């Protein structure tokens, strides 16, 4: 639905530095500031058989402020803060041209260039001294070496031109910058006096690649001149993509989902392989984390730990206690590594199978999806604790059972004896809950080994029963998949 299109071109980038000067008073001997300034430039050049018109803008950063001041006397020479560029300073050259490629520069999958370095040398500036020997600025040079292309925009008068920004590094060069007829010799670097040396333009040549993502709702019919710019793009409605994600569960499978859920999914494993733009593949993971932190579930984790810490120094009746410890068990499940099938495994599996078959179209929207699913998926779940072959099972809705392992018949529950063990003994997610398990034992009479395995939520036995095509387990896991509805 979103098609890659390569637009790699060989370009010639022409640019010139901008010089701003501010005079200090008196009779005209001193100066206040000599500094680099943003500089525009227009040109045209022949390439590939057509004349392409280009617009460039040069700017400087990291600039040093040398100084020189002959004293407080009202005629002694000096420049209060005269700049230079050296190792630290960078120069950006925003580049634009009328060619077709720059119309399709909104969404990009990749972008990188190869430009040839250049040597910029300083000119000759005759500081305007009213009388006497003429001071002479001369010399100084650097070399621009390309390092990295990014997106950018010229805030040009008539419109805002989306453009490519080339960040060139620097390298000080041989000619020792001097203030001749004056006390500054054998410096090195390019000062702001006359960075252009009278040249009409400093010139670079190279080749830049680009992989745009022009949209497509049909194979044969691909567009030109991408014009769905962020003026023409707007927030997809929250309920709208909620409905889309809910609809996506039309297609999810039964056993393949469990097979995926039995992976270790990490940051790289999930968030890689998303057909996204460059601006979102840069920080998708951090974007997801930022909104994951403030989710109701995450602040519930924080409240649990802080409440326990504060308690460390502070010193249907059953349904309420069971429900509260059920929420607590959900929190514990999320924070710790359980050895069972662990409902959040299934939640993450559904999440991956949903997001993989989507696309990023100028807005991340994995925030509000990953973090929202983390809290909404599988709203009512169940846990259990086995002890002495009398497993006590609990539901987040408040229900409770206590049934034997060898034969699945329940027993009167023991509140405050389940609570002593739920703190320390390992909790087992009940993906095969007591009701479905009783159905399975009644209809398909099972053995001690597989009974214990299903109680423990062993992936081996779960997949064995799924691949037996057991209707009970098949239907149960299908409903498990179906509550994942955001």
């Amino acid at each position: 639905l979103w098609k890659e299109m390569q637009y790699n071109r060989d370009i010639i980038i022409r640019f010139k530095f901008g010089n701003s000067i501010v005079k200090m008073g008196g009779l005209g001997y001193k100066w206040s500031e000599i500094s680099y300034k943003a500089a525009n430039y227009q040109y045209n050049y022949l390439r590939d058989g057509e004349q392409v018109t280009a617009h460039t803008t040069c700017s400087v950063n990291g600039v040093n402020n040398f100084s020189y001041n002959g004293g407080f006397l009202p005629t002694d020479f000096g420049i209060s803060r005269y700049e230079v560029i050296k190792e630290n300073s960078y120069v950006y050259v925003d580049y634009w041209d009328d060619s077709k490629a720059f119309r399709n520069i909104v969404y990009v999958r990749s972008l990188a260039a190869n430009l040839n370095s250049v040597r910029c040398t300083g000119g000759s500036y005759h500081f305007s001294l009213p009388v006497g020997a003429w001071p002479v600025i001369n010399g100084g040079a650097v070399s621009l070496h390309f390092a990295g292309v990014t997106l950018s925009t010229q805030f040009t008068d008539f419109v805002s031109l989306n453009s490519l920004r080339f960040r060139f590094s620097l390298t000080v060069d041989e000619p020792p910058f001097s203030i001749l007829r004056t006390r500054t010799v054998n410096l090195y670097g390019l000062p702001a006096a006359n960075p252009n040396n009278g040249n009409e333009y400093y010139e670079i040549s190279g080749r830049f690649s680009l992989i745009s993502l022009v949209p497509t709702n049909d194979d044969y019919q691909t567009p030109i001149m991408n014009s769905v710019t962020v003026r023409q793009d707007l927030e997809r409605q929250l309920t709208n993509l909620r409905e889309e994600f809910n609809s996506l569960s039309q297609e999810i499978a039964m056993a393949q989902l469990i097979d995926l859920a039995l992976l270790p999914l990490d940051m790289f494993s999930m968030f890689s392989g998303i057909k996204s733009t460059i601006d979102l593949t840069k920080s998708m993971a951090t974007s997801v984390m930022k909104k994951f932190r403030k989710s109701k579930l995450a602040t519930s984790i924080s409240e649990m730990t802080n409440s326990l810490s504060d308690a460390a120094s502070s010193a249907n009746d059953i349904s309420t206690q069971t429900s509260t410890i059920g929420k607590k068990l959900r929190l514990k499940e999320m924070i710790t590594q359980t050895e069972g099938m662990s409902f959040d495994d299934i939640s993450a599996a559904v999440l991956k199978t949903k997001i993989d078959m989507s696309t990023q179209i100028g807005k991340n929207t994995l925030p509000d999806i990953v973090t929202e699913a983390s809290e909404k998926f599988i709203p009512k779940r169940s846990y259990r604790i086995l002890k002495d072959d009398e497993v006590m099972e609990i539901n987040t809705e408040g229900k409770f059972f206590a049934y034997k392992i060898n034969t699945f018949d329940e027993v009167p529950f023991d509140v405050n004896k389940f609570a002593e063990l739920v703190t320390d003994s390992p909790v087992i997610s009940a993906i095969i809950d007591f009701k479905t398990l009783k159905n399975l034992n009644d209809n398909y009479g099972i053995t001690r080994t597989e009974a214990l395995n299903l109680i423990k939520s062993n992936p081996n036995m779960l997949r064995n029963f799924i691949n037996q095509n057991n209707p009970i387990i098949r239907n149960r896991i299908e409903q498990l998949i179906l509550q994942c509805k955001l």
Binding site: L260, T286, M289
Partner: peptide
Amino acid sequence: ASLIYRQLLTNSYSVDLYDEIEQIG
């Protein structure tokens, strides 16, 4: 597969320096 939620929560500290990037920039 649940490992990713734990990874998000554990590694969430870096969002602080990411928003530091955003505000300093």
